[model samples]
Every structure is written in C-alpha cells, then in structure tokens.
Target: VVTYNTLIDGLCKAGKLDEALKLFEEMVEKGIKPDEFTFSSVLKACARLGALELGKQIHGYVIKSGFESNVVVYNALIDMYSKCGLLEEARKVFDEMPEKD
Candidate 1:
C-alpha cells in the first residue's frame, strides 16, 4: 500500500494522471484497500488533472469504506476539490468540521 501510494504520488507529480488512476484502479482490483494517505495522494493527482468524475468516484468509495471521517482524508478531499474548481464541495466538506477551519 505504501509503495502504491508512492508510485501514485510520483505519477501525480510527473503529471501522469491517466497512469496514476490506472494504478489506483489496479490496486482496487487487487483488493488492496487504500488508506488515508493513499486516497490523499490519489486525490491530489485528480485535482491536478481536473479528473472530477474520477475523483468523485473515489470519494464515494472512501465514504462507502468508512474512511470519510478521517480528518486527513477529509482535509485532502477539501484541498483536492477546491483545487479542481469544486469550491462548493470543498466548502461542504469544510463545514462538516468547523473546528478544522
């Protein structure tokens, strides 16, 4: 999982969104559940790549898997959606944790 996150981060930094998302999908297919760190890294990539659909899909997965309450993941989601021009969604997330602001 750590290695997968690392690779996703590297790909994101290198502006390889498609490759990063592909790897993320492969990770899921392999039953490798992502952690907060993993989702954060992948979300960063989606933010940079303007992959709103993909990011939202992952967001659903995170929620379904009960990782949505993780503060780090929530922060990352806010950052990602904000960076992708989804300020409404970001604000909604931020509103969920007034103390976090």
Candidate 2:
C-alpha cells in the first residue's frame, strides 16, 4: 500500500519521526486529509521515540482532528502507554541505549 498516507507507517518504523511529522504537516497544509493509518503511523513513531513526552502532542492532534473513534487510533494510544513498565514508559533516548555505551 504505497498510499501517500500510508508512507508514514514505513517512515515511522525507521525512527524517522522528524520526517514523519514533517510530512504530516504537509498533508494537512496541502489539503490532503490523512486518516487513521496516517495518524497511527506517526503515533507509533512517537511511541518509538518516547511515549509520554511525544504522545501528548500526537494524542491531542488525533483527538482534535476527531479521528479518535477509529479503533486503530485508540489502539495506538493504548499500545503506546501500556508498553510502559513501573507505571511509566521509556525515559531513555535511543542514543542512550545500553548497547551504545
């Protein structure tokens, strides 16, 4: 599925949230409204980046956009937060990965 919308998912998994968010900005700017897959992809990217910190922005955007009813969108929210341990999600940045040291 090489939809202009779905590319965000491919971009997201690569830890390319910067580009993901940028494209999201463009989609909205260009009058190309993105749907659940589009939002979830970036949300997943934000989760991969840092859950709580990045989530609020993505979460707020998704809700205000009125796309939250899409089960997949809600799924992303639950997935990101639930993956946390000790009642908190990741606090480490990727460069701080244990293998990096």
| Candidate with best lDDT | 1
Model 1 scores a C-alpha lDDT of 0.82
Tens-place lDDT digits, model 1, residues 1-101: 88898898898789887788788889888998888878888787787778888788888877777785688888878888988999999999888863574
**lDDT, each prediction:** 0.82, 0.64
Model 2 per-residue lDDT tens digits across residues 6-101: 677777888777777777778877877778878677767666666455566666676578674566766666566555331333232222233322
List of clashing residue pairs for candidate 2: none
Q: Which stretches of candidate 1 lie over 4 Å from their true place?
A: 97-101
Per-model TM against the reference: 0.81, 0.67
